[PDB]
């Protein structure tokens with residue numbers, strides 16, 4: 001899968017969490033988002049095609065996925081503790097990670 | 107100034123930027139936010155006072171301020187180009203930084 005695929009996965013599953021018909025859908029969507037984020041971390045975005053992999057730009061791009069995965073993991077822990085409403089609330093705050101990275105590089 | 111006063115400065119000047127309609131107003135407000143963020147950047151909040159300075163929690167807290175300052179700087183550059191509405195949109199996206207740090211550390 002490529003970066004566009006990964007972003008579709010992130011977009012669809014963030015919306016699944018927002019609209020989940022049952023609690024179990026939340027964990028399943030978070031799990032798919034985590035994998036999409038780690039896959040996306042291994043891509044080069046079109047607007048950074050000219051930059052070194054050691055550029056401050058590519059460093060900040062990769063770091064955004066590490067930080068997103070950390071907060072996905074926090075939400076997964078809540079869902080695995082049965083606190084699925086709290087997990088859904090945490091997932092809502094993941095949109096800030098999307099908006100931040102996009103502001104830089106989308 | 108102390109942490110409470112720096113946080114009030116950040117709070118109020120976000121609204122100043124929202125209320126504004128010209129570049130000078132937005133620039134002045136962002137410059138005050140930058141100074142408040144930098145004033146609060148280096149201290150340890152009394153909740154992490156027993157944590158090591160290189161501990162993961164202090165590292166993430168310090169990065170919160172470093173990253174906030176970076177995006178204030180970017181918003182300032184837009185204001186200095188006369189791009190009032192782009193600077194206002196960038197300032198509104200700063201709320202993600204405020205909420206991220208608060209949810210971790212407050």
Ligand code: HEC
Pocket residue numbers: 003004005007008010011014045046060061062063064065068094095097098099101102105106
């Ligand atoms: C950087 C660390 C990112 C994070 C975190 C998220 N996204 Fe992203 N996204 C990023 C880039 C560089 C791009 C441009 C990709 C391109 O090839 O042009 C995108 C794009 C999207 C898109 C549009 C995809 C397309 O087919 O053009 C969507 C729908 C999208 N991103 C969604 C999305 C969501 C919901 C995120 C949070 C959960 C998210 N992204 C994080 C970089 C980064």
Ligand code: HEC
Pocket residue numbers: 109110113114116117120151167168169170171174200201203204205207208211212
């Ligand atoms: C960490 C890296 C933070 C960032 C980024 C922002 N804030 Fe914050 N804020 C932080 C702490 C640790 C505290 C509590 C300090 C204490 O001793 O209690 C706060 C508090 C506030 C407050 C309330 C002030 C009070 O006396 O309770 C406000 C109104 C506030 N913060 C606003 C704010 C805004 C608007 C921010 C982004 C622009 C922001 N903070 C960032 C830690 C951190």
Ligand code: NI
Pocket residue numbers: 067070071166206210
């Ligand atoms: Ni975090």
Ligand code: NI
Pocket residue numbers: 060100104173176177
């Ligand atoms: Ni950034």
